[PDB]
Amino acid sequence: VTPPPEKFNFAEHLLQTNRVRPDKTAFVDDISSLSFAQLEAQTRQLAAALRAIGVKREERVLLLMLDGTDWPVAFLGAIYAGIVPVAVNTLLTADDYAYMLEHSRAQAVLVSGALHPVLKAALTKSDHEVQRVIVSRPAAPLEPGEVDFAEFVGAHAPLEKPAATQADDPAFWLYSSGSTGRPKGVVHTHANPYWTSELYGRNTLHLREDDVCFSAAKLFFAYGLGNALTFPMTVGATTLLMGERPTPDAVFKRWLGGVGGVKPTVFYGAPTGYAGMLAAPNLPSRDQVALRLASSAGEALPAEIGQRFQRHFGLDIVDGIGSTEMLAAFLSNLPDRVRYGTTGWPVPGYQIELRGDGGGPVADGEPGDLYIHGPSSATMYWGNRAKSRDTFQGGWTKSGDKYVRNDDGSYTYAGRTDDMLKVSGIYVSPFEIEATLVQHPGVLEAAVVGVADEHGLTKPKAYVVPRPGQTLSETELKTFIKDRLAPYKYPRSTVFVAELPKTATGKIQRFKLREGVL
Amino acid sequence: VTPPPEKFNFAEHLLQTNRVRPDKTAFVDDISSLSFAQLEAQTRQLAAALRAIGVKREERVLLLMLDGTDWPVAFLGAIYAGIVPVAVNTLLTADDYAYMLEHSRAQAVLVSGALHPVLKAALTKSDHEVQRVIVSRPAAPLEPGEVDFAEFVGAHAPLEKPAATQADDPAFWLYSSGSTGRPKGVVHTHANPYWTSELYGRNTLHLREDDVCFSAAKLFFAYGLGNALTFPMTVGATTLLMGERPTPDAVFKRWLGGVGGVKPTVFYGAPTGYAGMLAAPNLPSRDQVALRLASSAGEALPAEIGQRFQRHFGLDIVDGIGSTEMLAAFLSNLPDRVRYGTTGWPVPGYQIELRGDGGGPVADGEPGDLYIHGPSSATMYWGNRAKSRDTFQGGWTKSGDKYVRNDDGSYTYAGRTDDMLKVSGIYVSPFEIEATLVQHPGVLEAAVVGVADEHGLTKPKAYVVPRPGQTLSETELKTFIKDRLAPYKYPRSTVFVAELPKTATGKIQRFKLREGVL
Ligand SMILES: Nc1ncnc2c1ncn2[C@@H]1O[C@H](COP(=O)(O)OC(=O)c2cnc(Cl)s2)[C@@H](O)[C@H]1O
Ligand SMILES: Nc1ncnc2c1ncn2[C@@H]1O[C@H](COP(=O)(O)OC(=O)c2cnc(Cl)s2)[C@@H](O)[C@H]1O
């Protein structure tokens, strides 16, 4: 892959590479569609519009939007102007977005109407710098200083040229949560999604122009941002977007061509979603779908899930591992080389190192801390020098995963190095769940650990000590949590115990809980 | 009043004042009591303990504690060591405390056991610098590294001298919220509580050594901090503290001598609480109580509440207005000079100005913006230069209130200049409540305004536009907000309307809602 030139604007790059296919559908969703030419026009008009409201090069805007045709316009339009979009999870709380507004110093927000209430709450509680709110598909009357996204785009002529950005200039942020502390602002350059889209989207997945890409992982996920934006635009594929929650029924409807007159040829999702789909009694037969490639990320793919999918569809699930920090997969199975129970082989262009506690090599078959050297690494966590130095050093990026290298060069996930859980491809801190449970007045202590279901898919499991003189229901706690945290941050099962296992120091013996002693 | 010396440590000042009365009870609560000697001992041992864990002079510690004998130990012990306690409301959310931890850079937390769960959540989610959590009266097992307050204090010899602070050095912070944005860190000096305790506590209220002080307003409120700590310690009075919520029954029990063998002689609280007590069927008779002085603040005292109290008890309610920024009252009725319907006269030592639209004087009988010039003003809002400039300008502190000066020199409250409400005498932002309501899926729009109830007390009133195509009941809306807002923020009434009055920009015409137009 040829490196991007020193002067490089990733949005310009994606627009330019599709000037040969102006009338092909770039993006289609439930209610709208954009050809590549329409996408380019709206992108450059939004770029002009953002500059007109005074957002300057390198300033941030918050992109808080459901998947839909407006999303790539917002993302690329900002980048084309040299403005840094901060693309965020749409399922978070007002508290979460309040922090993101403050930390990013976002000068404007591009928000879906359905998310306007939580954004409004975040704006009211925060010390933000937001000058304008741009509402895509408003679901309530606009407030002062808010503008409809279509009107905002429609009111400005296209910017003539992209900002004169450098390949190594920041292009966009994603936020990544760790086990404690605030979410980290992961800074990606213009070059980074070029490298992922070439090394992985084109050269590993072999995406091509006639594909129809459809990702259950939303665009704000590093995974989905490649799957359903940077990858397909790099090759001219058509992308199906879906705003609603990706349930088996919702995915099946898209697979069967229920939207846009298109049948996806390439699907991406999390192992949990594949398992839920394989269990569904209305699972389509392979004769009904156009799938040629099934991609997985976000959590390890149990061999039994992939084997069952392959038996039913005659397609493998191609499991790869990426991270927010590396932007896309650095270890992956190949479309025609799948070893279930492993994450496959280094993606060409990425170097992988496993390190033991001494920082030295580890023997094959022994677990080591996974480090990645690749051209798509984020530059830093914005405003967190300490965590940046711990994660990014000397061209190597520390994943916080443990991995085993097998005899055939494949890599098998061996767990985390920080108790983070990955439920449905989204990071979940067990400590955040625990601290919310203990706020319930009937809870004395609580411990949340990751426990595999029969499938080998890790889910949060709560061990709760009730307070004497109170009785607790499991649903009572789930509700209590949903009233405070994002809606997916709840234990999948809860066991009430008289006492938690602890060391002499009072430290909870989480391994005993995981291992099932109680 | 003689100014404090330039070398001045307020905690040492209060300890020194009471060395003449070592065996008198300083503080007593449901389960404990501290003589002035015991208080000084425990204060100086806590000061040494904080220094021993590395907290340095001028660093902050978060003081998140229910009222109880440990509270003045934590507060004065920090101050004695030259460490800045940040005394905060105990009814806030984990997100509020997470912000306060980061914003204050608190190096330790002193927390009541009952509040450890919300603190734990705040620690887990924030980028804090807390080195140690000290738990007063733990309600659940200590976590590794945490220490019990009693052990923490008991494990360290008393510091031999206080930090050699100056009178105008920061001594402590309180947090105060405005209609939007984060709570503001109000910075008070060592001199400020000297000025309030001398000018108001001693010279206006005439508190004296044989008083027993009891404040419904908690110690973290500027009002309560004077009422139940700086004022009584200044004169050697005994103070009754109560951890639980101040219901009429809870207050009556202590008025009647149910705790510590003492009957309060001085009571302080909000007009809302006085109204609640006057409505209580077991309102004590004046022969049953030892009250000689009843103070109110927080919201305007409706004349009928004062008059009914005076008719029942033969005792007036002495209404004074203070603020977090001014620390205590700057306009007040006097123990023997009460004009109901007014906040009385300037507190000697404080200069009052009413300013019009251009900053000039306003003619008597006309409302103006209230500005205060007095020696207890906070110096700034920490880390917010913009809001500091708008509030503190050249010796004058802008209250955010409007007032009318009467012919007899008294001052009659004329509302706020900023949409904030004082419900139950506590700051409530209508915008917070609105932003909570619109996150309910059946709510399209919401407007919250203050309306005076049957007793003349302002309560929030919600006007809600339901979302078309959704079912929404007043009961389900009450359930929705019950576990999302503190009770004092609950709208006392919700009206479902078809539309809200707006300007063309979408601004809600809240004045029309206050005028009953809907
Ligand atoms: N395939 C696979 N196996 C095992 N663990 C995996 C995995 N994919 C992802 N993880 C875990 O998730 C962490 C990275 O999370 P992000 O939420 O930081 O990155 C996303 O998962 C992405 C997945 N694909 C992309 Cl392309 S980006 C990782 O460290 C693993 O712990
Ligand atoms: N007595 C009285 N009448 C009318 N309004 C009053 C009032 N006291 C207080 N207010 C309002 O409350 C604002 C200040 O609120 P605060 O939480 O910063 O401080 C407290 O209310 C204090 C009250 N007494 C103390 Cl001593 S500290 C004020 O601006 C008024 O709007």
Numbering used by the authors:
A (entry chain B), B (entry chain A): 6 to 523
Direct quotes from the study:
BadA catalyzes the conversion of benzoate to benzoyl-CoA in the metabolism of aromatic carboxylic acids. Its catalytic mechanism is shown as follows: benzoate firstly docks to the active site, where it orientates to allow the carboxylic group access to adenosine triphosphate (ATP) for the formation of an adenosine monophosphate (AMP) intermediate; coenzyme A (CoA) subsequently comes in to substitute the AMP-activated intermediate resulting in the formation of benzoyl-CoA. The solved structures show that the benzoate binding cavity is rather small and narrow, constituted by several bulky amino acid residues including Y228, G327, S328, T329, H333, and I334. With the purpose to allow acceptance of various bulkier substrates into the active site, a double mutant H333A and I334A was created.
